[PDB]
UniProtKB/Swiss-Prot annotation, chain B:
Constitutively expressed. The HMA-like (RATX1) domain is responsible for the specific recognition of AVR effectors. The gene is PIKM1-TS. This is Disease resistance protein Pikm1-TS. Belongs to the disease resistance NB-LRR family. Residues 4-73 form the HMA domain. Residues 6-79 are annotated as: HMA-like domain. It comes from Oryza sativa subsp. japonica. The lineage of its organism: Eukaryota, Viridiplantae, Streptophyta, Embryophyta, Tracheophyta.
Length: 84, 79
């Protein structure tokens, strides 16, 4: 029931695939402040992700801030992984 | 070859048998370099490769593993 606080979120349950660069960011998807899932993604990059009812084009900046057209109730938030 | 693809599926998976079948099916698909099960619920199937027919792959997952949905389609940042 807390407001979204990435400092208190457990890390994503991720796998760094060995043949590609390690992605710099963790992402966390919430619906009305409840964590739905989490993963890894590249910084200074782009992806298409299913966020609730809609496909969303999400851009990441160099500090893992995520932007896109999130539908009502939903958000995807980023943060840099340790050491990046 | 080309810049690699990253495709993530969400597949409700009852247990580790289902997971094993999904990983085997994906690994046997043309173009796949690696596959892992990830996510908070252990139901994200993360696929990396080059020239994957994701159309056919989702169909095969739906027939053999469970009700697969796309979560993400992206390219790998290689530079």
């Amino acid at each position: 029931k807390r407001a979204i606080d990435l400092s208190r979120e457990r890390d994503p349950n991720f796998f760094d695939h060995p043949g590609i660069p390690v992605p710099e960011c963790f992402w966390f998807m919430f619906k009305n402040n409840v964590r739905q899932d989490a993963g890894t993604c590249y910084s200074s990059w782009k992806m298409d992700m299913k966020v609730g009812p809609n496909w969303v084009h999400i851009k990441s900046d160099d500090n893992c801030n995520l932007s896109g057209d999130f539908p009502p109730g939903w958000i995807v938030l980023g943060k840099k992984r340790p050491g990046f | 070859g080309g810049e690699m693809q990253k495709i993530v599926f969400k597949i409700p998976m009852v247990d580790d048998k289902s997971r094993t079948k999904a990983m085997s099916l994906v690994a046997s698909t043309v173009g796949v370099h690696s596959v892992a099960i990830a996510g908070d619920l252990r139901d994200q199937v993360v696929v990396v490769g080059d020239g994957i027919d994701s159309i056919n792959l989702v169909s095969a997952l739906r027939k053999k593993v469970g009700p697969a949905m796309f979560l993400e389609v992206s390219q790998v940042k290689e530079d």
